[PDB]
Amino acid sequence: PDVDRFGRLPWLWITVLVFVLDQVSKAFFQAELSMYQQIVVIPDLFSWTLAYNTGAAFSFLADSSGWQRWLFALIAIVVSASLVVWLKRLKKGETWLAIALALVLGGALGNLYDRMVLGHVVDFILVHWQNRWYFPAFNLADSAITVGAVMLALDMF
Amino acid sequence: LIST
Ligand SMILES: CCCCCCCC/C=C\CCCCCCCC(=O)OC[C@H](O)CO
Ligand SMILES: CCCCCCCC/C=C\CCCCCCCC(=O)OC[C@H](O)CO
Ligand SMILES: CCCCCCCC/C=C\CCCCCCCC(=O)OC[C@H](O)CO
Ligand SMILES: CCCCCCCC/C=C\CCCCCCCC(=O)OC[C@H](O)CO
Ligand SMILES: CCCCCCCC/C=C\CCCCCCCC(=O)OC[C@H](O)CO
Ligand SMILES: CCCCCCCC/C=C\CCCCCCCC(=O)OC[C@H](O)CO
């Protein structure tokens, strides 16, 4: 069959699927919302939003702004490469690792595309508790990465 | 990799 000639490569269809859903997601909320506008789903807990993440969380590392676009893109590129080879070196029946890797790769490329094409990453998911605390807005790419990362972390049993 |  064809499953045997491409090895572990067809797991990248999960990566593509993640990438696409991530980009359709962002495109929608770029179209439907203005910056920081929020569509309330659960008044106290959860809302859609629109935010551009130029990465101000790591602003403490430099007297310049705008470098996160390139540094983080660079890290994405580097980590993506190493993640692909490590997907290839896998065996059939290691289905847990393949999925986890594909998820992280999809999220990595999703935000990588943003930092390169746009100047920033698009964020639309706003989870919070009333006006007591707000969780930093994220997207599907982050979710794929986070779920992917946790799956890897629970692999060390 | 993530947004932030
Ligand atoms: C706007 C979003 C654009 C995103 C659209 C990208 C489409 C890329 C499709 C093919 C090129 C590379 C494919 C990479 C994954 C190939 C998996 C593979 O090797 O599988 C071969 C065989 O078909 C297993 O059944
Ligand atoms: C952003 C939300 C994205 C989450 C959406 C769910 C993600 C994937 C779920 C099911 C995988 C679908 C099947 C894709 C094909 C994987 C099976 C495969 O091709 O692996 C065989 C390989 O040859 C090894 O032997
Ligand atoms: C994880 C894989 C699941 C599928 C991945 C893609 C889904 C992306 C998530 C939300 C976007 C679509 C949800 C629709 C909710 C937004 C629509 C809305 O409320 O806007 C209406 C309009 O603005 C009047 O106010
Ligand atoms: C676990 C994996 C999850 C996969 C993710 C896919 C599920 C979609 C997420 C929420 C759906 C709820 C839809 C609520 C969005 C519509 C907002 C609404 O209620 O309407 C807005 C109105 O214009 C003003 O209130
Ligand atoms: C699953 C599908 C695979 C997804 C693959 C991830 C996306 C590729 C990342 C960038 C592509 C575009 C290359 C951009 C070339 C860099 C130069 C640039 O972006 O400059 C823009 C502008 O000139 C400065 O303001
Ligand atoms: C077979 C493949 C199955 C596919 C499985 C799909 C998993 C989706 C289920 C729950 C999503 C929970 C997502 C948790 C969101 C984490 C938020 C986050 O990562 O935030 C990022 C950062 O803080 C911002 O900059």
Domain limits, chain A: 1-157
Reported structure resolution in angstroms: 2.8
> A110 at the B interface (CB within 8 A)?
no
Amino acid code (one letter) for A60: F
The response to whether residue A138 sits with its C-beta less than 6 Å from ligand 6 reads: yes
Distance between CA atoms of A74 and A68, rounded to whole angstroms? 9
Nearest-atom number in ligand 5 for the CA of A15 is: 1
Nearest CA to ligand 1 atom 5: A16
| Tokens 């919302």 found at | A33
Supply angle C-alpha A69, A74, A141, rounded to 5: 70
Backbone angles phi, psi at A104, to 5 degrees: -65, -35
Distance between CA atoms of A74 and A6, rounded to whole angstroms? 28
Distance between CA atoms of A136 and A53, rounded to whole angstroms? 10
Distance between CA atoms of A139 and A49, rounded to whole angstroms? 10
| Tokens 């990595």 found at | A108
| Tokens 């702004």 found at | A65
Structure letter (DSSP) for residue A154:
G
Distance between CA atoms of A49 and A38, rounded to whole angstroms? 4
Q: How far is the CA of A124 from the centre of ligand 5 (A)?
A: 21
Residue of chain A whose Cα is closest to the Cα of B2: A142
A56: Cα separation from own chain's centroid = 17
Nearest-CA neighbor of A19 among A151, A155, A148? A148
Tokens of A42: 């659960």
Tokens of A77: 């590129």
Residue A123 among the catalytic residues = yes
Residue A22: other Cβ atoms inside 10 A: 24
Residues in B closer than 8 angstroms to A142, CB to CB, are 2-3
Distance between CA atoms of A83 and A65, rounded to whole angstroms? 29
Distance from CA of B4 to the nearest CA of A (A): 5
**Last residue before each break in chain A (C–N > 2.5 Å):** none
Nearest-atom number in ligand 5 for the CA of A119 is: 25
Distance between CA atoms of A3 and A116, rounded to whole angstroms? 34
